C-alpha cells in the first residue's frame, strides 16, 4: 500500500507548503469533489500525497496540525474521506508521475 503518485523531493531546508487551493496532484481518474488530501514526509526528504481519509494518516481530518503533514485542496473539493480511491498496490499499478497545474507555487528546493 503506497501513494498513488511519485514523491516531491525536498532539496532545501524548508518544509513543503502550498497556497490555499494549490498542491493536489493531477489525476484524471478522479473527480472535482475528490481533490483534497495531505502530503506526508516519509519516515533529502520525500513528500508523498494521499487523498483525505486514506494512507498512513487516514484517520486525520483536514487541517490537523502534525509535524511532517501538510494539507492541500482544490476549489470544488468536498471534505469527505476518499474511501473509494484508497491507496495504490504497486504490484497492480504504477505510480502516477506527480504533476501540478501550471502556475502552482512551489517553494525553493522543490
Amino acid at each position, epitope marked *: 500500500t503506497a501513494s498513488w503518485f511519485t514523491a516531491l523531493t525536498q532539496h532545501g531546508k524548508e518544509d513543503l507548503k502550498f497556497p490555499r487551493g494549490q498542491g493536489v496532484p493531477i489525476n484524471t481518474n478522479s473527480s*472535482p469533489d475528490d481533490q483534497i488530501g495531505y502530503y506526508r514526509r516519509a519516515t533529502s526528504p520525500r513528500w508523498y500525497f494521499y487523498y483525505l481519509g486514506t494512507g498512513p494518516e487516514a484517520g486525520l*481530518p483536514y*487541517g490537523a496540525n502534525k509535524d511532517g503533514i501538510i494539507w492541500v485542496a*482544490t*476549489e470544488g*473539493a468536498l*471534505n469527505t474521506p476518499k474511501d473509494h480511491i484508497g491507496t495504490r498496490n504497486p504490484a497492480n499499478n504504477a505510480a502516477i508521475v506527480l504533476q501540478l497545474p501550471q502556475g502552482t507555487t512551489l517553494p525553493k528546493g522543490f
Partner: antibody
Amino acid sequence: QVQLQESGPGLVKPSETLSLTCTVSGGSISSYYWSWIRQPPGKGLEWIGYVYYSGNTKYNPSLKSRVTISVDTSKNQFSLKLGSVTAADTAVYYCARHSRIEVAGTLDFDYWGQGTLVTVSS
Amino acid sequence: DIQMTQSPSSLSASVGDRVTITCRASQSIRSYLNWYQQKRGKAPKLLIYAASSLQSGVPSRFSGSGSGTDFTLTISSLQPEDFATYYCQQSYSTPPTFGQGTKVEIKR
C-alpha cells in the same frame, strides 16, 4: 448575511413533476455547493441532492431515477425537479448551502431557506 | 447508506439542568457529524459541526462530543428557549443522512 428563499407553497398533482427554485441573496452561488433537503410532515430530514455552481450534481440513490437539479449563476438561483410524485413526496422542501473549509465544501448545511410545503394531491 | 439512531426520542428537563442527547452511527464516521436545532415551522439551524465545533453565533451552553460511532449533544444549562427537535447528521459520505430527532421540552 446570506439569505435563501424557496418558491411559494402549493399543490402538485400525483404523477406530475414538482418544480422549485431557490433564490440566493446577500451572497453568491459561485464556489459553494447547494442542496435540496426535504421533511415530510411529522418526520425527519431527507437529503435529495446537491449541485456545484458549475453544474455538476449528485443525487440521493433513492431518488436518482426521477430528480434533476440545475443551477443558473446569472440569476443566483438553483432549482429542483422531482418527477412522478406521490403522497410520499408531500414534504417541506428546503434549499441549503454547504459550508466551506478553506477552498473545500463540506456536507455541513450552514444556511437554509425558510422551507416550502409541497402537498401532493389531486 | 449510513443509519443514524438518536435517543431518547423525547425528554423533559428543568431550566438550568444539563441535557445530553445521544446519536449513534451504523458505521464509524470519526468526527464527521453535525447537530441541528429545529423549532416548529422553521428550518434547522446548525449548532455543532465536526462533532464538537461550535457554529459561530450559537450559545456556548451547546457542546458536542464523540468520534467514531457514539456522539452526544449537551446543553449544559437548559434555557426556556431551548425547546426544539434536535437532529444529528453524518457528514462522512453521500448521501448525508439524519437521525430521527430528539424532542426537548422544558419541565416546569
